[PDB]
Design a protein around this ligand. Structure first.
Ligand SMILES: O=C(O)c1ccccc1NC[C@H](O)[C@H](O)[C@H](O)COP(=O)(O)O
Length: 243
């Protein structure tokens, strides 16, 4: 099964939170324009993340303009919101804090739209040598061990785990490959590595650690990595991608 490259677009009020400077692009803040561009250059999937209704309009336009899978995330707190996002064209929804506080939400979405529709995002940090699950964008220690939550999440019916290591996020220092390795034998689900990507070699390392997809925002936002070059590089180094 081919490894996937996934671009994460941070969105506020249905616009991309710029500093973008895509001169080739007409409007760097239009998420449909930016998403379509990524689609065309070889990105395999998109994640639209609301960092703060306008989301429903965004999903609508994205759905009819873009022909690759896309996930929506960021403050989905209930079944009704997930349902509405999926019906209006989102392929997947990502939930985190709302999954920790009501794990049945996972199962409710999976039963209604299929397991492949639910992505559970997990933010973990090291606390006294143990990986612990944090909610509220890394503000709250749930007291839940990463090793138990991963097992609960699959059991509840999740289709994928988006594995965010908050202490690598934005740093460009590499993915947290130790955490990916820790999670790999605990679950059979596809693991999406998230946070830290800085150079092509970092993607290789994440795939070697056992990720099935690698998500990045910084290196695609700051235009640092050519997607096609990245795919050729991974292929050259024995990683199965699609070209
Ligand atoms: O997804 C969240 O709510 C969240 C939570 C805690 C810490 C970061 C969070 N989101 C940030 C995104 O997941 C972030 O864009 C990705 O991890 C990719 O980051 P970079 O590629 O390092 O720029």
């Amino acid at each position: 099964l081919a490894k996937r490259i996934i671009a994460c677009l941070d969105v506020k009020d249905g616009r991309v939170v710029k500093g973008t400077n895509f001169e080739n692009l007409r409007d760097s803040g239009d998420p449909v324009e930016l998403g379509k561009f990524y689609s065309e250059i070889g990105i395999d999937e998109l994640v639209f993340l609301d960092i703060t209704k306008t989301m429903l309009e965004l999903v609508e336009k994205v759905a009819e303009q873009i022909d690759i899978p896309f996930t929506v995330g960021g403050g989905i707190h209930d079944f009704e919101t997930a349902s509405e996002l999926i019906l209006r064209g989102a392929d997947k929804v990502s939930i985190n804090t709302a999954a920790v506080e009501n794990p049945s939400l996972i199962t409710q979405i999976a039963q209604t739209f299929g397991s492949q529709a639910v992505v559970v995002a997990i933010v973990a940090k090291r606390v006294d040598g143990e990986f612990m699950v944090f909610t509220y964008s890394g503000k709250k220690n749930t007291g839940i061990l990463l090793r138990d939550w991963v097992v609960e999440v699959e059991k509840r019916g999740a289709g994928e785990i988006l594995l965010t290591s908050i202490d690598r996020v934005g740093t460009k220092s590499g993915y947290d490959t130790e955490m990916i390795r820790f999670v790999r034998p605990l679950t059979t689900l596809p693991i999406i590595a998230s946070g830290g990507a800085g150079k092509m070699e970092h993607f290789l390392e994440a795939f070697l650690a056992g990720a099935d997809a690698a998500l990045a925002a910084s290196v695609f936002h700051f235009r640092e990595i050519d997607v096609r070059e990245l795919k050729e590089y991974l292929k050259k180094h024995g990683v199965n991608v699609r070209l």
